[PDB]
Amino acid sequence: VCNRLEQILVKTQWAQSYGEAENRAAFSRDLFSELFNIQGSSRALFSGVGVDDMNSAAFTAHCLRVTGALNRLISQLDQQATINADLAHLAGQHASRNLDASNFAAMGQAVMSVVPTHLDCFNQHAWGECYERIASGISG
Amino acid sequence: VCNRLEQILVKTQWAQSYGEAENRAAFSRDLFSELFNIQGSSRALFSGVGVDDMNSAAFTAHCLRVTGALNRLISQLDQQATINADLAHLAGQHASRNLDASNFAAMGQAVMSVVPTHLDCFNQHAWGECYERIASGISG
Amino acid sequence: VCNRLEQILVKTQWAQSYGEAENRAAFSRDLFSELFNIQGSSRALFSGVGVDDMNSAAFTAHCLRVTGALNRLISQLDQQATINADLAHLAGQHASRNLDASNFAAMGQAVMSVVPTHLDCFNQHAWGECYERIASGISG
Amino acid sequence: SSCCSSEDRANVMHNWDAAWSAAYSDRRVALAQAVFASLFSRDAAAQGLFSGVSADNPDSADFRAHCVRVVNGLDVAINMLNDPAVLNEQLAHLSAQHQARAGVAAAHFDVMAEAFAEVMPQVSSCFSSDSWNRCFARIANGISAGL
Amino acid sequence: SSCCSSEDRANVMHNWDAAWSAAYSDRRVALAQAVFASLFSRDAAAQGLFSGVSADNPDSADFRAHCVRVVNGLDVAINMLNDPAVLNEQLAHLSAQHQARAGVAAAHFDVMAEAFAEVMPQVSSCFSSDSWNRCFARIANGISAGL
Amino acid sequence: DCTSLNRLLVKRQWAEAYGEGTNRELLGNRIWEDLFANMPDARGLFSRVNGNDIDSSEFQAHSLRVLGGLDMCVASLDDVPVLNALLARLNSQHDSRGIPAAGYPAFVASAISAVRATVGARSFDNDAWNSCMNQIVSGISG
Amino acid sequence: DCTSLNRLLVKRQWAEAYGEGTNRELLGNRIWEDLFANMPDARGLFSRVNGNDIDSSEFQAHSLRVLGGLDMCVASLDDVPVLNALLARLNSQHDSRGIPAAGYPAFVASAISAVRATVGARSFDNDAWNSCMNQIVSGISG
Amino acid sequence: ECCSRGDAEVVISEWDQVFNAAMAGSSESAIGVAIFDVFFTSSGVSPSMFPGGGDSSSAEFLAQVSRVISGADIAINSLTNRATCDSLLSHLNAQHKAISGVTGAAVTHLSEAISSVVAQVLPSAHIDAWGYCMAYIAAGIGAGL
Amino acid sequence: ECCSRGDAEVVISEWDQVFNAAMAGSSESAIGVAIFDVFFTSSGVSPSMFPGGGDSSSAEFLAQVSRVISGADIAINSLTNRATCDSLLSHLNAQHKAISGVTGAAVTHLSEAISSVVAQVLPSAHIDAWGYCMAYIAAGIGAGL
Amino acid sequence: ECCSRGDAEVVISEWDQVFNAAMAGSSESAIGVAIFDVFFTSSGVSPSMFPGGGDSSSAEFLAQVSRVISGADIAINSLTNRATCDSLLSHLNAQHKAISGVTGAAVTHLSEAISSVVAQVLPSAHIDAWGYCMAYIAAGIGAGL
Numbered sequence A, B, C: 001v002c003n004r005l006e007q008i009l010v011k012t013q014w015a016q017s018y019g020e021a022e023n024r025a026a027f028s029r030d031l032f033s034e035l036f037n038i039q040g041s042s043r044a045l046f047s048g049v050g051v052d053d054m055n056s057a058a059f060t061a062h063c064l065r066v067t068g069a070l071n072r073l074i075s076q077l078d079q080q081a082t083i084n085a086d087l088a089h090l091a092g093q094h095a096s097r098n099l100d101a102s103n104f105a106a107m108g109q110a111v112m113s114v115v116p117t118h119l120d121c122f123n124q125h126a127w128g129e130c131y132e133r134i135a136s137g138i139s140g
Numbered sequence D, E: 001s002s003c004c005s006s007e008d009r010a011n012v013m014h015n016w017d018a019a020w021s022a023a024y025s026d027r028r029v030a031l032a033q034a035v036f037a038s039l040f041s042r043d044a045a046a047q048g049l050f051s052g053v054s055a056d057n058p059d060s061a062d063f064r065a066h067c068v069r070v071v072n073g074l075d076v077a078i079n080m081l082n083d084p085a086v087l088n089e090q091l092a093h094l095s096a097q098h099q100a101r102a103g104v105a106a107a108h109f110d111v112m113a114e115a116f117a118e119v120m121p122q123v124s125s126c127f128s129s130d131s132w133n134r135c136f137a138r139i140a141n142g143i144s145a146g147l
Numbered sequence F, G: 001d002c003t004s005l006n007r008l009l010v011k012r013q014w015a016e017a018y019g020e021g022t023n024r025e026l027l028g029n030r031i032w033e034d035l036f037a038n039m040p041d042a043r044g045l046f047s048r049v050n051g052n053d054i055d056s057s058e059f060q061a062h063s064l065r066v067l068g069g070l071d072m073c074v075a076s077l078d079d080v081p082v083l084n085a086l087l088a089r090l091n092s093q094h095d096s097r098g099i100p101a102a103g104y105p106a107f108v109a110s111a112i113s114a115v116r117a118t119v120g121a122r123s124f125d126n127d128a129w130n131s132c133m134n135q136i137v138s139g140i141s142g
Numbered sequence H, I, J: 001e002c003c004s005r006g007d008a009e010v011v012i013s014e015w016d017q018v019f020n021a022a023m024a025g026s027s028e029s030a031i032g033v034a035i036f037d038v039f040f041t042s043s044g045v046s047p048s049m050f051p052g053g054g055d056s057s058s059a060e061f062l063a064q065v066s067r068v069i070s071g072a073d074i075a076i077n078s079l080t081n082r083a084t085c086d087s088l089l090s091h092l093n094a095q096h097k098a099i100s101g102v103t104g105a106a107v108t109h110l111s112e113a114i115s116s117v118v119a120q121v122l123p124s125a126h127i128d129a130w131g132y133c134m135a136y137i138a139a140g141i142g143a144g145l
């Protein structure tokens, strides 16, 4: 899942969206705003990172960690052993959170809702495949 | 000292300088920067208001109090009984500071150095007279 | 009076005001307009240079001679023997005019009213000192 | 024969540039590997022509270097599309090099074109297929002339 | 220790440039003369260190040339504030030169800083004292390192 | 030594100098104009590609092939096995042409000067460029 | 002869070429690039300041010290006693380094060309610059 | 101040120049391994305390390098919003407090290795701004260590 | 947040509209006396605790009114730089802590009198922004009272 | 015409280039002494008729040089307002009529020395515009002499 060519499209389109965003904090907050608007029940999962005020330093910091992690993962999609190790680390970090498939699905919808609004060109399928690669590695 | 006509020039020129300043904090800090540059010994008098860092909240707040006081005094130059009362209040506030004539002179030079650099027209004499009115009331 | 450092401030600020004035005639006329507005009695002293019409060629020429003289003097503040000789020449030229201290004082106020309105930075004390150096040399 | 217009050249150069990795060889190798995999699937006999570059192991350094050479050659040609006088010299150069390889034939260039047409939409955003097809023909026909 | 920020460097470079006489040595000599007069007033013993440049007669050509050297050295350092890699080499150079002068000590640089802080507001319009103090420290500390 | 950090700087600066197709010819011309000025006898080696008029179509295509070859090597500096296979082919393409050994250091000087002129002197690192260019020509020359 | 009028022209043109701090490095580089091209053996004299990479921090600081030294001399051209004291120190700083006598005329040519390139040829006066630069190096060289 | 808005902008710009469109996504591993090499030499910290034992041929260490460069990236890019940056640093501080053998001095050494490697790949780097802003980062990550 | 940057800008703009070029320097006394009248009615605080006993015919009270309107002016005009504003309010807090009979509730009443008088002379006033920003001011001046 | 508006603008620009921010206030004496040296050689006028006897080591002559360069500056800078310039020249004419031994030819020689020295320090100088405008100046100063 997420073949070598699909990785080219996703790396390029991430570069053109996240990579060119003038306000990285806003981009990252938008992702979570979209997540909560897609799946209202997901918001309570973030009670430990100041989610009651999405403009807080605490919540903004969480959002930046998440898009930073998306960035570092997308950068290593082509390095199987490295990304597998990094995904396993992230899976450990999410294990105690009692997430389910619907949570990962909603996040994928959030990613694929935000990214193309920063682009002139977007490839839905490649993004679905490579999001699946990441989500499967983090969910276990 | 500071006759009714001189007051018109000073009120008008203050309005055009302080009154139109887009950055009141900067205007006020500039006054004190000029004071310290005129009379280096004056700086130590402000040790209680964070003067070691002129860009501090504490020192900026002091500067704003001072130009606010200049503003309220200039607004009442024509109301003898009121300004006399207000000047007496200020004199009380400065009494414990052990200031001398040279300090008041340096402040006058500071005021008359900053104000005209914000103006197209400036009347040196009227400003000297009305600064004297204020300084004499505060020095006792 | 007018020490070597004060001369640096005055030379620099003159350069930035007179030296950068796009309309030297207007700058020079403004000086005399300010002089007459400060001391009305001074105007009659200029009856020989067409003062009834301050926009006349005759009066404008006088004003330009005066600011030209200020320029050449400020340029030599640091050359004691030369400026002393030049000041003595000017004193000779003013001797028959029966001027008094109040006239020189008013001119100083005029200079210090016009100059800073062309500047972002002005040093009142240095200008007072160096104006005094010039005035004392011309008055005798 | 459909002409590779000024507009087509702009489209191709844009797509090619936008997908280019300027400092690292990995992406251009991945692109070429996919092209060759398609070529060999379509024409099984063609693989033999590449015995001198270890086509039997497409992950080998030997084959990956060949991939770099081919993509570089195409990159140079694409970047010459707005200077066709220079392009002609480049294509004549490449033609001579292919004439020197026994068994390489004009028909192979048609299969190679099918391979790029399959692969480019998988690596290039907003890919202009018609402009690519016409301008790849311009380039390929220049190389295959004389064989 | 307060950092000499990008903003401070801009302020210092602006004040320094605005006061600079670019074609003649007179002004920079007057500036340095005032600095040395202040230094020697504050620390009477310091004057002995300058016996090799006729400090006993500050109006001498010998001492005036020293004044030119010191102000030039500071001018070069100030103009390097936006290129601190280069600044470090310059300050290391000046440090070596001062290490070679017997009796020159770190404490003298504190007195020199007091002297410039007294003199600069007398020669520079709209002088930014805090930025000067922080950036003079940046420069002086680089020279006084190792003594 | 062409170190890991050297390769990173050379890659980035090469991508700036070469990364946009227009003005590849400008980079190329800077190299040849310099090389032929310093080593006029080298011009004769390029007779087949019309080197007397470096602005000719034949020479311009040659120049752009050379830059493409450098690009392949720079892109592969982090992959020594692929780099070695690229250099092996370049070596085959340069042998038995009577190219003097001295031509290679001259080309390296010319190429480095050209890149420096294109990206600017203040960010340039001559040691990195010399080290990495020398690795490249060491594999070509012979 | 470096006449009074020559000194006035040289002062004004130097102030234009050097007067703004940014691009002092640009003036310096023009000098060294030219000098080392014409006199490659001179580069060796600067080994302690990393002259093989003129773009290095060590060499750039040296270059800026040199320009500062020229600035001191130009600023003092009208004050011969101060100029002589400046040149005396510069002489002390250049002796026993094995600097060839020929290095000085070469530097003068390089410096003049650099200033000319910076301020423009149409207002330039080569005689004035040569005369005044020669007064300067006459005091340094030895 | 120390790491002013202006200093932060320079640092962000320079980090962006290193990780520009050509280099971003491909050079992190090389930069990171170089940072670790300088850090091990200056700090004396054992590579064995790291995932994959600090072996650059190990995917576990390569993933650690990816994480460290990314954490640095996030902190650097937040330098102009101090409240957010403070929060990022506090999170990193908590993570390192949960790891035996992380000292304040070692955190300083790693931050200085970031600066020094940046200056090697970007010779024009503003070494002072990097020093001030990396010291702010080190103070936050190393708090109480 | 409460008294956001945007709220502060509205409040500053509206105070500037009241004290515009025509009115500034001439209307402070009338505005101030009106503010005190509303404050005395809402707070129940004795006028006798003020200079001149709260008598508008007394120069001592008129000078007090001048001071209060000026203090308000300084605080309002600093609302967009919260650190500076916090300092101004802390100074005012210290001054009122040194005065017997100043309560937090009374400080709130005076701040609301400022808002209410502004809305009377400027009917378009953004009463919500004034409420939020005057509450921030009152919280600072009235701290611990 | 002779010394047109355009000619005057060129002359003013070139005099401003000589006396630019770097040179103004420091170079007048050197320029002036050079002008006098050329003038004495071309005119045959005795230095003894001048203050300090034309000795550049004399402060009286240095002050005279300051005056002459300043008079030239004032006239030059007024070249685009002919009525004002005419008045300046008439004043200078009166001053020289009161001095024995000033001839029209000598006035011409001094004006040409100004032009020639300018061209020596500014090799790009528009020598024709300088000739026409200095001839206008000389005609005014030398009227009836």
Ligand code: HEM
Pocket: A042, A045, A046, A047, A048, A049, A062, A065, A066, A069, A070, A090, A093, A094, A097, A099, A103, A104, A105, A107, A134, A135, A138
């Ligand atoms: C598939 C893409 C995802 C990525 C790249 C990602 C990344 C991250 C990262 C980097 C952290 C911080 C780890 C740390 O430093 O402690 C984190 C924390 C967390 N993530 Fe995710 N995540 C993903 C998906 C999700 C989903 C689908 C949810 C839930 C709907 C989720 C819920 C959480 C929670 C609850 C935390 C902990 C917040 C806390 O510290 O209280 N994540 N994630």
Ligand code: HEM
Pocket: B042, B045, B046, B047, B048, B049, B062, B065, B066, B069, B070, B090, B093, B094, B097, B099, B103, B104, B105, B107, B134, B135, B138
């Ligand atoms: C003549 C015009 C002046 C005006 C309008 C003025 C105004 C003020 C004001 C409003 C305050 C704050 C009072 C408070 O709330 O406690 C103050 C404090 C002070 N003023 Fe002035 N002042 C003037 C002149 C001077 C001069 C000439 C100096 C000294 C050179 C000076 C030194 C001080 C000091 C030391 C304080 C106390 C700072 C602290 O709280 O530690 N003032 N002034």
Ligand code: HEM
Pocket: C042, C045, C046, C047, C048, C049, C062, C065, C066, C069, C070, C090, C093, C094, C097, C099, C103, C104, C105, C107, C134, C135, C138
């Ligand atoms: C202190 C600065 C002054 C400077 C630099 C200055 C300069 C001059 C100059 C250059 C002239 C023309 C001399 C000539 O060519 O004949 C002049 C004339 C004159 N000045 Fe001044 N002056 C100064 C102050 C004053 C003052 C204070 C007054 C009177 C308030 C005054 C009154 C006159 C008069 C009456 C003339 C003669 C006008 C005529 O020709 O009828 N000057 N001054």
Ligand code: HEM
Pocket: D046, D049, D050, D051, D052, D053, D066, D069, D070, D073, D074, D094, D097, D098, D101, D104, D105, D108, D109, D110, D112, D139, D140, D143, F089
């Ligand atoms: C537009 C399309 C093509 C381009 C740009 C291209 C480019 C290149 C380049 C640059 C080389 C290296 C030449 C050398 O170093 O001597 C090469 C080699 C070669 N090409 Fe192509 N080529 C293309 C199409 C084809 C096709 C369609 C075939 C046949 C199936 C083919 C077969 C070969 C062979 C057999 C070699 C030699 C490999 C070796 O080194 O052993 N090429 N090509």
Ligand code: HEM
Pocket: E046, E049, E050, E051, E052, E053, E066, E069, E070, E073, E074, E094, E097, E098, E101, E104, E105, E108, E109, E110, E112, E139, E140, E143, G089
């Ligand atoms: C930032 C401050 C300073 C700068 C930029 C500076 C710069 C210079 C320069 C450029 C020289 C000439 C070096 C040579 O030609 O060998 C020099 C010489 C010297 N400096 Fe400083 N200096 C500074 C502070 C000090 C201080 C604080 C002292 C001690 C009081 C000091 C003592 C000396 C001495 C004794 C010499 C040798 C004079 C001679 O030639 O005989 N300097 N300095």
Ligand code: HEM
Pocket: F042, F045, F046, F048, F049, F062, F065, F066, F067, F068, F069, F070, F090, F093, F094, F097, F099, F100, F103, F104, F107, F136, F137, F140
């Ligand atoms: C890093 C250094 C160099 C690179 C990357 C390079 C690259 C190339 C390339 C790609 C070709 C075309 C090969 C082909 O397809 O047949 C070529 C041809 C050639 N190169 Fe180089 N080259 C380099 C240095 C030099 C030097 C130093 C010389 C001689 C002074 C030289 C002389 C030639 C000649 C004579 C040809 C053949 C021209 C022809 O086709 O007739 N090269 N080079």
Ligand code: HEM
Pocket: G042, G045, G046, G048, G049, G062, G065, G066, G067, G068, G069, G070, G090, G093, G094, G097, G099, G100, G103, G104, G107, G136, G137, G140
């Ligand atoms: C007008 C001409 C020149 C000026 C103003 C000048 C100025 C300077 C200055 C200011 C220094 C630093 C002195 C110190 O602080 O130790 C220096 C060093 C040096 N100069 Fe010159 N210089 C000139 C010409 C030359 C020439 C023509 C050469 C040789 C071809 C040369 C070779 C050197 C060397 C080798 C050093 C020492 C580098 C080191 O520190 O290792 N200079 N020069």
Ligand code: HEM
Pocket: A089, H045, H049, H050, H051, H064, H067, H068, H070, H071, H072, H092, H095, H096, H099, H101, H102, H103, H106, H107, H108, H110, H111, H137, H138, H141
């Ligand atoms: C500027 C300084 C530093 C930065 C930016 C930094 C950054 C990071 C980041 C982003 C992580 C990943 C956290 C996670 O997701 O679980 C991490 C983990 C870690 N860091 Fe650091 N670090 C720094 C200094 C240090 C130092 C000085 C040491 C050792 C003395 C150290 C040892 C570790 C270890 C052992 C881990 C955990 C590996 C694991 O258990 O997965 N770090 N660091």
Ligand code: HEM
Pocket: B089, I045, I049, I050, I051, I064, I067, I068, I070, I071, I072, I092, I095, I096, I099, I101, I102, I103, I106, I107, I108, I110, I111, I137, I138, I141
């Ligand atoms: C928004 C609320 C308020 C503001 C902006 C304000 C402002 C001020 C200012 C600027 C001063 C002058 C301080 C000085 O220079 O010494 C002052 C003094 C004073 N205030 Fe307030 N005040 C507020 C609320 C109150 C309240 C609620 C009371 C009474 C319960 C009060 C009672 C006083 C008194 C008695 C003085 C001192 C008069 C004197 O001794 O000179 N204030 N206030």
Ligand code: HEM
Pocket: C089, J045, J049, J050, J051, J064, J067, J068, J070, J071, J072, J092, J095, J096, J099, J101, J102, J103, J106, J107, J108, J110, J111, J137, J138, J141
């Ligand atoms: C372009 C031509 C000339 C210009 C611009 C010029 C300008 C001046 C000026 C501005 C003064 C000062 C007047 C004052 O303030 O009293 C002056 C004075 C004088 N000029 Fe000229 N002049 C010119 C030609 C000449 C010539 C040709 C001679 C001699 C033959 C001459 C001889 C003198 C003398 C002797 C004085 C009076 C010195 C004194 O008694 O203080 N001038 N001139």
Ligand SMILES: [Ca+2]
Pocket: A116, A117, A118, A119
């Ligand atoms: Ca959009």
Ligand SMILES: [Ca+2]
Pocket: B116, B117, B118, B119, C116, C117, C118, C119, C120
């Ligand atoms: Ca102004």
Ligand SMILES: [Ca+2]
Pocket: B116, B117, B118, B119, B120, C116, C117, C118, C119
């Ligand atoms: Ca103005």
Ligand SMILES: [Ca+2]
Pocket: D024, D025, D026, F078, F079
């Ligand atoms: Ca690779």
Ligand SMILES: [Ca+2]
Pocket: E024, E025, E026, G078, G079
């Ligand atoms: Ca001089």
Ligand SMILES: [Ca+2]
Pocket: F055, F056, F057, F060
């Ligand atoms: Ca051609």
